[PDB]
Amino acid sequence: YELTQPPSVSVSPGQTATITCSGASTNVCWYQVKPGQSPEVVIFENYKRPSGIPDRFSGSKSGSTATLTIRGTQAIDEADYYCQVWDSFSTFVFGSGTQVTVLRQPKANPTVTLFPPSSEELQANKATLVCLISDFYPGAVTVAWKADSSPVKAGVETTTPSKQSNNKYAASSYLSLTPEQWKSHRSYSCQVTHEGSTVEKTVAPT
Amino acid sequence: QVQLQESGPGVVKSSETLSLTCTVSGGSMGGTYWSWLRLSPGKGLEWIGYIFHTGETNYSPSLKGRVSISVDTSEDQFSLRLRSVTAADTAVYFCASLPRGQLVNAYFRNWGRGSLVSVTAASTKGPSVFPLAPSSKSTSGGTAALGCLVKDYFPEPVTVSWNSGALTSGVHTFPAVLQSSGLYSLSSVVTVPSSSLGTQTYICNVNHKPSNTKVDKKVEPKS
Structure with a gap:
């Protein structure tokens, strides 16, 4: 079982990226994953930002669908993003992942x-x-x-x-x-x- | 200020035990569920298990029975052992941490950089080569795709040419997939004018150097 995410979200330089995570009954967090680097959480409890994460990252949840928004997406924000929810049986379930790309x-x-x-x-x-x-x-x-x-x-x-x-x-x-x-x-x-x-x-x- | 370091990436022979360690630097070993996760194309990001400083563990039901985690609270290290690995256990393995307590809203912190563990077969095996036939249907000015499926070989690589190198335009050989069996397969496809079918002969030439095998297969329209 995985939470459903779009495989690809991409924007022109200057635009805002919106990534969805469907099938989540409880609160969602989001990890930024880049090749060869330690993953890091960017949003938890649907919209809360940990310290050190820039203001342009925000979140929202409505019913079972969570969204991650990255305003004025920058090169440093290009990565795969995975959502996560807790689960009674599996403890943690993750989304399929969304690659965020600034279009070249x-x-x-x-x-x-x-x-x-x-x-x-x-x-x-x-x-x-x-x-x-x-x-x-x-x-x-x-x-x-x-x-x-x-x-x-x-x-x-x-x-x-x-x-x-x-x-x-x-x-x-x-x-x-x-x-x-x-x-x-x-x-x-x-x-x-x-x-x-x-x-x-x-x-x-x- | 707290950094986790996994043992380097490696190869493990299929059927054997995968063994990793994570070293913790900074903070305490208490108050924390020291965790393992993995990331692969075939199963995405998965939690594997965690351990509390007392040695109490919790494991994914999916792996319960063949996974074990241990901790050394003075050496600040914890381990992952996964028995009877198959190709499906090929992944980037991560260590991370969770604060002790209720997990419904919890997120993983202090992730390691990840270590690729490739589960590999051992014995050489040459491929079977099957035609991927185009339709004999007529497009007015259109194209048809035809190809060769190079199935179940080990190790990599396989090379593919068409008409002994004389056909290069429209040729696309795709990277291989790895099956659960630990064997590879790939496909090579050529896009040709649909009118050339029945006129031009198309033969795929497949070389698998590790098994000293070459196969030529003519690919004809579906009868």
């Missing part, structure tokens, strides 16, 4: 290409769905797989986005199934979320 080039929504299992693979008693995701910016996405219309989490592997030649990003995701699972469902889908956009592709057995 225009936003670009992903192209998605989905391949079904090949006949050769099925003959080897295996089945792999292959979802290729390219030409997006900024470089963060969420990939969701569905069996018919129902989410599937098991057997999924997804790469971290990497920079392509054209200076945009690409990623891939794979779903492992048994041939029986492949053949017995109406269809499987790969759905990619990026900023305001979702792109879904669907394939079905023949």
Whole structure:
């Protein structure tokens, strides 16, 4: 179980970033995470700032959705942000994380290409769905797989986005199934979320 | 003023025990739940467990049974041991602290910088190569994607070319994923004019030097 966050929030230089965290029944805190650096809390109890955190960080919560706001987002604020709530059973549950980016080039929504299992693979008693995701910016996405219309989490592997030649990003995701699972469902889908956009592709057995 | 330092990053052999330590500098070892968390692509940020100076522990239900944490209150150090690791336990591991008391509003402080622990397989395995066939459907002036799936190999890397290097435009080979098994897979796809299907032959050439294997696979339109 994770709290739902958008994978990517980005702004032009000068603009304010707003990051949401859904599914939280109690109070939320937020951590700034950068590669190779100690994470640090920026907001706790929904909107309270610890000492040393600049005024431009603020927060709000309404019902089960918390928001982190960063006014006049600066280069130093570029990072992944994770929300957190307490949980009776798991003690702590965290969000999926949101990459905050100041745009160095225009936003670009992903192209998605989905391949079904090949006949050769099925003959080897295996089945792999292959979802290729390219030409997006900024470089963060969420990939969701569905069996018919129902989410599937098991057997999924997804790469971290990497920079392509054209200076945009690409990623891939794979779903492992048994041939029986492949053949017995109406269809499987790969759905990619990026900023305001979702792109879904669907394939079905023949 | 209080800084936590984790033992460096390392590799652990799949099936063995992951072992980390965190050294605390500044403050006291009392009044605190000394904590471990981890961060990975496949499971995001997860709390693992904590320990109070008395030695009392609390562990994530998800790991209960194969995790253990201990503390040395004079050496100002605490440990994480995780048994029977698989590829899925590859992550950046963090130590941090929580104030003793009610946790509903609590947040982690004094995080360490994190240590990447990679759980790795041991034995070489060459890939299977499966075609990713394009449709034979006709787009008026459009493109088709076709590719090769390079499945279940170890260790990295694999290289892929098309038509023995003669085809380079429209080629995109994606970085590999690591499966729970500890084996890698990747895909290479080429975008071609949809009209070239049935005219131009497309063969992917896959090299896996560690297993001294090369595979050539022609990729044809779905029959």
